[PDB]
Design a protein around this ligand. Structure first.
Ligand SMILES: Nc1nc2c(ncn2[C@@H]2O[C@H](CO)[C@@H](O)[C@H]2OP(=O)(O)O)c(=O)[nH]1
Lengths: 96, 96
């Protein structure tokens, strides 16, 4: 299930950076940016393979790509944030 | 993010000195000169470990290494100046 909506202004600032890169189709910092998200645990609505894609939200100070991601779906403004490596997701509201 | 491009001639004269030392591969005045800059804070673009190196820009009168540095990247002409110990950076333009 999606755990509700979150305002974009409330997320780490790097979430805005990632959304801007998604809007321009990159260039992205990581080679794994833009791979298909398989939704293996069915936390997001079930869709055909390839509907969802994932992108890194950089965590400053982290030595890895970290645990923050944006997952896009195909619908307009269908962008989900996870801060916990795909355990929970929130729909991003870009208007607040 | 990088805060713009600045002409070399607009920087303190010591920045010119450090660039000339980098071009000759030293010798450098400080032992820390040439160590890897981690980009831990993700202020500069994401790159592999060892892409960036740090060099002192001497601050006149200081007893310590102070807060001024040049960070090189591996690309041609890719050099960043900070006067505030890595809080902000500007790209150096050696052509002006
Ligand atoms: N802030 C910061 N310091 C760095 C980085 N890479 C190397 N350093 C050095 O690591 C020290 C802290 O562990 C910092 O004081 C800085 O020392 P310098 O002043 O020698 O550059 C980096 O990515 N960020």
């Amino acid at each position: 299930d999606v755990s509700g909506t979150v305002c974009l202004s409330a997320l780490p600032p790097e979430a805005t950076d990632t959304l801007n890169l998604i809007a321009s189709d990159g260039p992205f910092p990581y080679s794994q940016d833009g791979v298909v998200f398989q939704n293996r645990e069915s936390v997001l609505p079930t869709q055909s393979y390839g509907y969802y894609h994932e992108y890194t939200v950089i965590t400053p100070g982290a030595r890895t790509r970290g645990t923050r991601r944006i997952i896009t779906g195909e619908a307009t403004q269908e962008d989900y944030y996870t801060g916990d490596h795909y355990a929970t997701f929130s729909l991003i509201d870009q208007t607040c």
